[PDB]
């Protein structure tokens, strides 16, 4: 009884984490946009051969 | 709620028997107009349906053939404009040009 | 560009083929000689008949089917009948001796010298077509040559062609009405061969159609011609989707994918509606509701089995005529509400419905009337094990005393085949039993 | 100028498009031969969004037609307005899918989709500034539900920033005509939630109910249902093609209708609808339009919206009217039904006005609603799917093409997660 | 402005409503096609009270027709002016009531009432400002007496402040048309007394007496009775639609006529009614009008007013006259008939004047009275009820539908109590 | 604190308790193993009212199972929630009573009752401050009807001050399972009238009517009826275990419900009862709850409560709401049904409230009414008893176990006296 109560209490003490970041097209497009916006400058820096 | 019976004798002519009102009852003469108009309308098509009463049921509807711009012009129904014969081989496919290919190109 | 190949083996097979080809010849307007009579026929893309006929380069059209039989009488009758100019002369393969109701005769001794020619004919006809949908086979189980040649050709085709679809409209012996006395034996052997070599198997018992014809058409003495004409009507209703446009069309590959849940179970039974005489056709309503209610009546089964003793798992219904999807759906809802017909738990939806515009055609001189709405129904149900159990009883009662078995051992096949086929049938009945259990 | 291309496949999709472009051509005054015969210049100013240019001043579709068997295209070619379509845009297979998701997405689809992908890539690069894609298909069939969704995945991988619309018609348990529909429906929805930006769900049972109850016409056909769906489709993109008081594009609709990226399923409706024996007796006014807008039975989905709470709603009005009555009607309907709207999203209603009514009408209304009541349809579909799956019925067909039960389990799990996340956001308070 | 909706159920209610709508369309100048062909501008100033406007300028009445068998309404659409009613305002069953209050009020009446409640709610909310409801029906029939009173209860539950007029054609034993009349009549009057704001009783025998005696026409028929009822019912609400000197609405009538909440049963009369012989031979003067108005035989009720004392009376003169002569005639009829007016209230007669006479006439009078002579109808109905109920005749048809005889006991007790509390003022003295 | 100990006997009482402990454990978050798994702190402060603490933290019921057939015991132990009971509390005979009240009250009951007396005294001493006893049984059996009544008599002898209540499933004639019912019912009610402080009667006929009508479930079962009775029997002790605006314990109810010491039989009901396929709409506000309360055909007894006059009524509301609507609605019921309430006890309704609603409800209520209606059931039972007793049928077994006709004649005389004195209060006037 005591061990079962310990297990139930220690499991019930854990729950409140939702943090919604469903990410398929949102994050794919986010990666694409950040890549473009970042690599434009790194394209306009290169030392010519 | 009545017979409309009109006949020369007054005890059964209604219009003669409804005349005690202070005014002319719009109903009697309206029915007169409906009857005479229905006769003329039936004259146009040709029905002679053994009495005028048969076609008077549907000679009065004001429903237009098409829509009056308060609903989608879906029409009265595609099935309405269908005509059916029953000879064999009327519904075979046609294989139009888009699907009419011969040569099955060899390479990609 | 889609074609199917028809196989007719056995005397009953040839008789069924004659009627079905008469119906096909009529419905495309083909004259008995084989040439288009209208003379207004046009080219271009009007080749609807390609599913059954092929243009011969000069005039006529030849059917895409083969006739196989070891007894020459029926083949000679076809070659001398009214359709002499229709079939290819070297397309009706004839044997020399009949199998005499012995399976070993047609499976081990005589059929080996005919199977090669039949396969050559099949190959040379097959390379002609380009859109092969599949094979339909017709055979009477309770006949020696029929069963033997059917089995041998099925085994040969299963390895020569592979994944091509096969539908077998097989004539099993009736539980009490039968001609021969040794049909349980070769029926066992044919079932053993057919279980693992055919994709769809359709029951075509005789006394069921006898009772239907007696009840509906008011005919006291039907013959095999009426049987064959009804079979032809069923086949045409099945196939019309491939050669006539409709709102919801289906294909040959569309039936096994929606009718057999498991590879082992592929046996099912059919129905056709309505069956109405000419005089009867007047004083009736002929609506989709009543025709679809008649299609599920147990007396309208094409096989002598009562579905009320078993569960349903799948059924395909094809309507032809001026039906509408809303009305067929309302009829389906009424059927589902009906309690006399119940389905298995793991199949909430078990209806595959197709709609075609072409009304059925009527053969002149026939018995059945014509109406513009027809339905053909193919249901697979658990109750079908009843006929297998009856045929097993017949097999046991005579295998206990080893009757007639000398004329099975004397043609080279060992006595051990009976035990193997019996065990296979027992396993099949087992599977048909556990398939219907609730979870 | 921010044009959109059309993609469609399957028998249902082809039937939808064949009449949808008939409606569009009628709206823009284009004859079946492709020659302009309109009345106002506005019908021609923004013609480039849907129609390209050809020799002789005629206009040709930017639409792509796909399927595994030639019957549907053979039918659509000979129908009215069938001469517009360029013969090149037709891509067709010689086998057919046979109501098999595995066949339509793994075996034949893999080698057939390359040509249609090349065609759509050429069409997309042709336009100066692409705006987005719209797909119209059925998830109960094989060819559509397989190859259309594989193409959706491919196009999503190729064009990230563009918008995708999906007019999805899903089989319902009542009007059912296929036995293996739950399997490929679940597979399609699981693959579809991963890529589709917006989804609009359509139910044939709901459409039949609309026709039986509202139009009161005894014997409709698939043509009338396609006409209703086409009117709904043409409504949403009206403001992009014609001027108006408040401009609005599909991107604006997505922004104002997507609270969370995983919540992208909508139910649509059209107004006004009335029988021909009752047309003379109804007055077209904003109150009548807005009350028929929000009536539960009018919706084109089996979901009853009063079983849940609306998250967002949008409205497109067509015709000439003042903004005041529309705004006050929106305020009034939000006030009177506060219980049916979620509480932590105040002002969950969006409006747009376009001054060009449909041909033969004076005012029209298109409604797109994102609400939590959609979850019941997924719940029923999942119930049927699991009921068939516990017994492994009809599984050998799908296993015959490299597929196993791993993706079955993960798809059903993802779908249950989607249902749970709709339920969570409905049962939440500040 | 301050408009009222109309509801009718049952065959008698349908006929009365049809004739009333013909009369009102005549008075306001609407053709059977719904297009205005009036002459004076006064016909359009307050047209919105009884009609709504639709596309094309055609006006439609805001009336609802309800019944359990489509025969009567199928006839009313076929009759003249049957095209005015909007087809959606027709609600019908398929079984019929069979003269059974239980069927029409408990099982199938409650089954069907939802749709009609929806329609009436829609119509009531559509208009700007309600003023009240008016019902016309019978108590001796099944469907009317049951479903109408159920609808009365439902609508009173939703609109507690609005006025409710009822035109009830109560049964008379001389003109008997059904054997089970007292049962459902008692039940309906029971359920009606606590909800109806004003009841006005009409007697077929009384109208027959009017036609045979005053009009002296050989073969009268229900059309004439319907038309007289329509004339009176239209004259009830003349001042609300037309200008006058002393406007009086339904609430004004209620306040002037109702001393106590449970005393709201009225008897009506219309004047002038002239025979076929003397239409040119009688002058039209206020004395003549009031003399014909106060005549006992002129009432629309079988009860003799001469057997009781009026609690209150009201008259609605139409046309042009002098208010002083109206007042003098009222004062004379009060002094010379002091024995017939209850003493402890002074000046218990009200006069109102409207400037528009009925079409085709110079002056007219509509009279409404609350007196104690109404007790006779309830007395005879109750004695018939008890004499038929002590033997429990025809009781099993009622009790076999979830219905019990104890409510019959309560109905009889309540009617005895109402009779007693309505007659104790006859002998009550200050 | 102020706990009550549960004692059940006979098959009826055993089945009643089997579901009572189920409902209570579900309400208080207790598993079949006596393990607490609740979420709120409010579930445990008053848990000692029905439960006792054991080592390890388990809570066990203070219930005493008594019977004559071991079959009931090992049937109820094997079911769910059967492990809560301490086996030492089980007491059962081995020969049975055979529905013989004499055999159960004189021969075997007296012999066996010693052990159950010992255990009940042990529990009564163990409890800190005894509040009362509560019993559940039926008069349609023999063993219950005898040994119960004897146990009540003796425990009242030892505890004349503590309150006590009993629930009685009384037999009904239309659905009757024994010809001995009049005999043992009369004997047991004679014993109970002078002993039980409170008695509450239940009718299986009324239960069947309820589950057929308002639940619309086709197949009821004894489990379903036991669930209904357990819900009602849990509702009464709501505020005793949970806080509220006005807590009102069993002693309060006893003080407020009984006018005279011999009148302590009650009929009850519960609300709301919605159908199983209840659509999701609205909420159960006070008006419909209090209407469904006083629907006389909602009562759990076959007696028609409108056949007589209510001596008093009591309402236990459960949920959070104000008392203004409470008391105004109760006065409204008073004024509208003043005929059903006897005049010399004005304002004769108990109102009590608890803040914690039942599981799965927002608002609920239990009604307990003492009305003059029960006299008809006593009259019919007495009529059946005297009809069976006039020729001394089945009497010889009852005479063969030590008693004679004297007990029967005194019991029937006491019954007639009870009925008469109960009826004079019906027609008594102020
Ligand atoms: N339904 C139907 N069955 C037939 C027909 N003709 C023959 N049969 C069946 O065939 C069985 C006997 O086999 P047959 O078809 O006559 O001959 P076979 O199958 O070629 O075998 P053999 O007798 O060796 O020639 C009979 O029991 C019939 O049931 C027919 O036209 N219609
Ligand atoms: N609303 C509507 N539904 C259609 C239409 N055509 C087909 N359907 C539906 O689509 C389902 C069959 O889909 P199917 O043709 O197999 O899809 P595909 O395999 O991708 O071509 C049927 O249940 C029909 O209800 C149409 O024109 N309109
Ligand atoms: N004055 C008048 N009375 C009518 C008319 N139609 C029916 N009634 C009366 O209504 C009674 C029958 O009522 P019924 O129609 O059966 O009631 P329902 O069944 O509820 O519709 C008869 O006794 C008639 O006297 C009518 O047009 N005018
Ligand atoms: N409501 C209800 N009534 C019951 C139940 N069990 C028995 N009864 C009633 O009790 C009567 C028989 O009582 P009986 O078993 O002889 O009582 P016992 O002798 O004390 O066991 C029957 O008429 C049943 O209606 C139950 O679980 N619930
Ligand atoms: Mg042969």
XYZ file of C-alpha atoms in Angstrom, chain E:
430
model
C -44.609 49.561 -36.934
C -45.856 47.698 -33.838
C -46.871 44.905 -36.191
C -48.601 41.623 -35.345
C -48.139 38.130 -36.770
C -50.962 35.705 -37.549
C -51.233 31.984 -36.790
C -54.025 29.569 -37.671
C -54.487 25.847 -37.207
C -57.309 23.446 -37.881
C -59.801 23.478 -40.721
C -62.026 26.191 -39.256
C -59.040 28.350 -38.383
C -57.653 27.920 -41.886
C -60.922 28.949 -43.535
C -61.377 31.965 -41.257
C -57.789 33.038 -41.867
C -58.083 32.651 -45.625
C -61.211 34.790 -45.758
C -59.663 37.354 -43.408
C -56.578 37.625 -45.594
C -58.730 38.091 -48.688
C -60.585 40.879 -46.881
C -57.401 42.597 -45.685
C -55.814 42.385 -49.126
C -58.994 43.962 -50.483
C -58.968 46.758 -47.900
C -55.295 47.614 -48.424
C -55.586 47.216 -52.196
C -53.426 44.199 -53.071
C -54.157 42.072 -56.131
C -54.010 38.253 -56.021
C -50.543 38.551 -57.595
C -49.281 40.632 -54.669
C -48.745 43.864 -56.621
C -50.057 47.197 -55.357
C -52.985 48.583 -57.376
C -54.286 50.970 -54.746
C -55.660 54.461 -55.182
C -54.936 56.586 -52.098
C -51.570 56.952 -50.408
C -53.138 56.001 -47.065
C -53.134 52.361 -48.193
C -49.323 52.223 -47.968
C -48.503 54.261 -44.849
C -49.052 51.383 -42.405
C -48.946 48.452 -44.818
C -46.029 46.899 -42.918
C -48.314 46.036 -39.991
C -49.826 43.035 -41.776
C -47.489 42.452 -44.734
C -43.777 42.134 -45.358
C -42.179 43.290 -48.605
C -40.144 41.087 -50.940
C -38.256 41.356 -54.210
C -40.174 43.019 -57.010
C -42.302 45.035 -54.604
C -44.739 42.224 -53.826
C -46.205 42.038 -50.330
C -46.694 38.778 -48.424
C -48.729 38.317 -45.226
C -46.933 37.265 -42.053
C -49.218 34.322 -41.398
C -48.496 30.732 -40.383
C -50.705 27.806 -41.391
C -50.579 24.615 -39.340
C -52.460 21.314 -39.480
C -52.116 17.548 -39.388
C -53.622 16.629 -42.764
C -52.636 18.449 -45.976
C -56.163 18.502 -47.418
C -57.384 21.821 -46.044
C -54.201 23.706 -46.888
C -53.987 21.984 -50.266
C -57.447 23.440 -50.883
C -56.522 26.883 -49.567
C -53.571 27.184 -51.937
C -55.894 26.180 -54.787
C -58.474 28.788 -53.824
C -58.224 32.415 -54.870
C -55.601 34.527 -53.095
C -53.940 31.259 -52.099
C -50.746 32.393 -53.799
C -50.125 35.186 -51.280
C -48.942 32.846 -48.532
C -45.267 31.946 -48.547
C -44.876 28.174 -49.067
C -42.485 27.933 -46.111
C -45.227 29.153 -43.745
C -47.166 25.918 -44.326
C -46.529 23.156 -41.787
C -48.441 19.893 -41.968
C -48.487 16.426 -40.486
C -49.378 13.174 -42.211
C -51.670 11.335 -39.764
C -54.324 13.802 -38.626
C -55.745 14.404 -35.175
C -58.932 12.374 -35.524
C -60.814 14.783 -33.238
C -58.576 13.528 -30.414
C -57.086 16.106 -28.065
C -54.546 13.576 -26.806
C -53.109 13.013 -30.280
C -52.947 16.711 -31.078
C -51.512 17.821 -27.741
C -49.293 15.032 -26.384
C -47.604 12.672 -28.848
C -47.657 13.795 -32.470
C -48.616 17.377 -31.695
C -45.515 17.676 -29.533
C -43.594 15.778 -32.209
C -44.501 18.327 -34.884
C -44.647 21.572 -32.888
C -40.873 22.116 -33.056
C -40.843 23.185 -36.709
C -43.769 25.584 -36.344
C -42.183 27.037 -33.207
C -38.997 27.610 -35.197
C -40.917 29.355 -37.976
C -42.909 31.598 -35.637
C -39.762 32.520 -33.706
C -38.043 33.424 -36.975
C -40.951 35.582 -38.112
C -41.313 37.294 -34.730
C -37.613 38.137 -34.558
C -37.537 39.332 -38.168
C -39.909 42.237 -37.633
C -39.003 45.487 -35.900
C -41.445 45.715 -32.978
C -44.077 43.156 -32.037
C -47.404 44.301 -30.658
C -49.045 40.938 -30.055
C -50.290 37.665 -31.471
C -53.709 36.725 -32.826
C -54.987 33.144 -33.045
C -58.171 31.896 -34.728
C -59.387 28.372 -34.056
C -62.015 25.974 -32.733
C -62.395 24.127 -29.450
C -64.709 21.372 -30.700
C -62.142 19.871 -33.066
C -59.027 17.844 -32.478
C -56.021 19.413 -34.157
C -56.987 23.024 -33.548
C -58.035 22.669 -29.930
C -54.927 20.659 -29.110
C -51.990 21.947 -31.101
C -53.121 25.572 -31.119
C -53.352 25.687 -27.336
C -50.022 23.876 -27.011
C -48.491 26.537 -29.254
C -50.185 29.210 -27.135
C -48.533 27.804 -24.023
C -45.149 27.584 -25.741
C -45.258 31.111 -27.163
C -46.449 32.576 -23.869
C -43.469 30.878 -22.234
C -41.188 32.850 -24.571
C -42.971 36.235 -24.853
C -44.528 37.032 -21.467
C -45.313 40.710 -22.106
C -47.016 40.603 -25.514
C -50.790 40.641 -25.936
C -52.638 37.541 -27.122
C -55.957 37.662 -28.981
C -57.904 34.444 -29.470
C -60.907 34.010 -31.768
C -62.474 30.804 -30.477
C -65.485 29.272 -32.221
C -66.862 27.442 -29.176
C -69.414 24.623 -29.608
C -73.210 24.975 -29.266
C -75.484 21.989 -28.533
C -78.131 22.938 -31.107
C -75.638 22.889 -33.992
C -73.846 19.621 -33.209
C -71.187 18.287 -35.581
C -69.229 15.859 -33.369
C -70.005 13.592 -30.431
C -66.783 14.097 -28.437
C -66.992 17.903 -28.401
C -67.320 18.609 -24.636
C -64.165 16.701 -23.687
C -61.631 18.527 -25.832
C -63.578 21.787 -25.548
C -63.256 21.693 -21.760
C -59.597 20.696 -21.934
C -58.725 23.515 -24.324
C -60.667 26.186 -22.447
C -58.884 24.986 -19.301
C -55.437 25.312 -20.851
C -56.438 28.598 -22.499
C -57.834 30.538 -19.542
C -54.456 30.919 -17.802
C -52.510 31.966 -20.906
C -54.777 33.883 -23.290
C -54.875 37.609 -22.618
C -58.197 38.047 -24.434
C -60.621 35.367 -25.596
C -63.496 36.273 -27.912
C -66.163 33.641 -28.414
C -67.989 33.067 -31.698
C -70.998 30.809 -32.231
C -71.989 29.123 -35.483
C -75.601 28.992 -34.306
C -75.443 32.711 -33.532
C -74.124 33.512 -37.005
C -76.823 31.307 -38.538
C -79.408 33.290 -36.585
C -77.882 36.547 -37.835
C -77.987 35.430 -41.458
C -81.523 34.050 -41.341
C -83.019 36.944 -39.377
C -81.262 40.200 -40.239
C -79.868 39.402 -43.681
C -82.874 37.324 -44.828
C -80.860 35.454 -47.469
C -82.290 32.167 -48.696
C -79.322 29.756 -48.793
C -76.374 30.989 -46.726
C -73.197 28.923 -46.467
C -69.980 28.924 -44.433
C -68.521 31.532 -46.778
C -70.929 34.104 -45.368
C -70.122 33.191 -41.766
C -66.395 33.301 -42.482
C -66.833 36.682 -44.134
C -68.773 38.203 -41.227
C -66.146 36.922 -38.799
C -63.461 38.405 -41.050
C -65.224 41.768 -41.144
C -65.448 41.950 -37.355
C -61.874 40.758 -36.839
C -60.567 43.328 -39.321
C -62.609 46.068 -37.669
C -60.963 45.189 -34.359
C -57.647 46.687 -35.525
C -58.648 49.619 -37.742
C -57.205 52.419 -35.599
C -53.715 50.896 -35.487
C -53.559 50.986 -39.303
C -55.375 54.221 -40.101
C -55.388 57.793 -38.777
C -58.175 58.902 -36.486
C -59.182 61.225 -33.687
C -58.830 58.805 -30.738
C -56.472 55.948 -31.558
C -56.862 52.784 -29.488
C -54.646 49.703 -29.663
C -54.936 46.172 -28.288
C -53.326 47.046 -24.959
C -55.680 50.009 -24.603
C -58.620 47.677 -25.192
C -57.254 45.202 -22.646
C -56.761 47.870 -19.978
C -60.215 49.326 -20.577
C -61.926 45.916 -20.640
C -60.103 43.792 -18.038
C -60.818 44.626 -14.368
C -59.363 41.328 -13.156
C -56.856 38.957 -14.778
C -59.214 35.969 -15.024
C -62.103 37.982 -16.533
C -61.111 38.202 -20.188
C -63.853 36.413 -22.159
C -65.607 38.710 -24.624
C -68.500 38.700 -27.058
C -68.367 40.700 -30.268
C -70.770 42.440 -32.637
C -70.582 44.216 -35.971
C -72.771 46.916 -37.485
C -74.460 47.856 -39.708
C -75.908 44.640 -41.132
C -78.663 45.353 -43.642
C -80.912 42.987 -45.543
C -81.118 42.745 -49.319
C -84.306 44.808 -49.355
C -83.415 48.080 -47.647
C -79.790 48.870 -48.509
C -80.920 52.066 -50.244
C -83.829 52.614 -47.851
C -82.056 53.072 -44.503
C -80.234 56.197 -43.391
C -76.752 55.952 -41.867
C -76.779 57.821 -38.567
C -75.035 57.350 -35.228
C -78.382 56.654 -33.442
C -79.269 53.940 -35.945
C -75.793 52.419 -35.736
C -75.799 52.294 -31.940
C -79.351 50.939 -31.813
C -78.395 48.089 -34.137
C -75.127 47.603 -32.226
C -76.720 47.202 -28.801
C -79.422 44.813 -30.047
C -79.216 41.507 -28.197
C -80.082 39.456 -31.287
C -77.193 41.106 -33.174
C -74.499 39.440 -31.057
C -72.157 36.746 -32.365
C -72.841 34.521 -29.337
C -75.665 32.154 -28.459
C -75.780 33.624 -24.949
C -78.432 36.280 -24.400
C -76.828 39.500 -23.099
C -80.240 40.422 -21.661
C -79.739 37.722 -18.997
C -76.662 39.409 -17.529
C -75.044 42.730 -16.702
C -72.166 44.099 -18.750
C -68.960 44.686 -16.845
C -67.431 46.745 -19.641
C -68.011 47.588 -23.292
C -66.012 49.194 -26.083
C -66.945 50.523 -29.520
C -64.748 51.426 -32.503
C -66.556 53.829 -34.817
C -65.215 54.269 -38.339
C -65.656 57.182 -40.720
C -66.463 60.821 -40.082
C -68.898 61.841 -37.338
C -69.106 64.076 -34.276
C -67.532 62.904 -31.041
C -70.194 64.731 -29.047
C -73.024 62.762 -30.656
C -71.082 59.549 -30.118
C -70.812 60.468 -26.440
C -74.470 61.486 -26.151
C -75.672 58.228 -27.696
C -73.437 56.256 -25.335
C -74.755 58.246 -22.378
C -78.372 57.622 -23.377
C -77.802 53.897 -23.835
C -76.146 53.862 -20.407
C -78.962 55.711 -18.614
C -81.889 53.876 -20.190
C -80.133 50.529 -19.692
C -78.779 51.121 -16.187
C -80.230 47.821 -14.965
C -77.966 46.052 -17.473
C -74.710 47.703 -16.344
C -72.916 46.922 -13.096
C -73.328 49.867 -10.749
C -70.125 49.966 -8.740
C -68.074 51.145 -11.748
C -68.967 54.447 -13.467
C -68.798 55.007 -17.222
C -68.004 51.424 -18.200
C -68.237 52.013 -21.972
C -65.364 53.227 -24.152
C -65.540 54.876 -27.570
C -62.805 55.167 -30.178
C -62.906 56.798 -33.608
C -60.993 56.046 -36.800
C -61.122 58.222 -39.901
C -61.149 55.459 -42.545
C -64.435 53.559 -42.984
C -64.555 50.025 -44.400
C -64.234 49.785 -48.160
C -67.566 50.499 -49.815
C -69.322 51.840 -46.706
C -69.807 55.195 -44.991
C -69.785 54.327 -41.271
C -69.328 51.139 -39.274
C -69.163 50.005 -35.652
C -67.262 47.148 -34.027
C -68.406 46.383 -30.483
C -66.643 44.220 -27.894
C -68.253 43.391 -24.576
C -67.307 41.761 -21.279
C -70.492 40.699 -19.486
C -71.740 37.914 -17.239
C -73.983 36.291 -19.863
C -71.048 34.222 -21.174
C -71.532 31.844 -18.234
C -74.277 29.972 -20.110
C -71.921 28.441 -22.678
C -69.623 27.134 -19.963
C -72.592 25.907 -17.912
C -74.034 23.874 -20.777
C -70.616 22.549 -21.817
C -69.893 21.501 -18.231
C -73.242 19.772 -17.702
C -72.804 17.884 -20.967
C -69.286 16.966 -19.853
C -70.385 15.577 -16.500
C -73.434 13.766 -17.907
C -71.149 12.090 -20.450
C -68.214 11.476 -18.097
C -69.983 9.824 -15.163
C -70.419 6.844 -17.510
C -66.818 7.184 -18.800
C -67.990 7.052 -22.408
C -65.367 7.465 -25.147
C -62.756 7.646 -22.390
C -60.422 4.836 -23.450
C -59.327 6.581 -26.657
C -58.128 9.447 -24.487
C -56.604 7.367 -21.706
C -54.720 5.075 -24.079
C -52.191 7.750 -25.070
C -50.492 8.452 -21.752
C -53.476 10.525 -20.640
C -55.392 10.317 -17.361
C -58.938 11.122 -16.218
C -57.712 13.139 -13.244
C -56.911 16.090 -15.489
C -60.524 15.808 -16.631
C -61.533 16.061 -12.984
C -59.360 19.167 -12.573
C -60.761 20.689 -15.764
C -64.326 20.231 -14.542
C -63.470 21.675 -11.129
C -61.698 24.663 -12.688
C -64.617 25.391 -15.005
C -67.087 25.249 -12.119
C -64.808 27.591 -10.169
C -64.502 29.981 -13.120
C -68.279 30.020 -13.587
C -68.794 30.748 -9.893
C -66.165 33.504 -9.737
C -67.504 34.984 -12.977
C -71.134 35.053 -11.826
C -70.633 36.234 -8.242
C -70.101 39.742 -9.649
C -73.574 39.493 -11.216
C -75.137 39.719 -7.749
C -72.252 41.497 -5.997
C -73.321 44.961 -4.840
C -71.374 47.909 -3.459
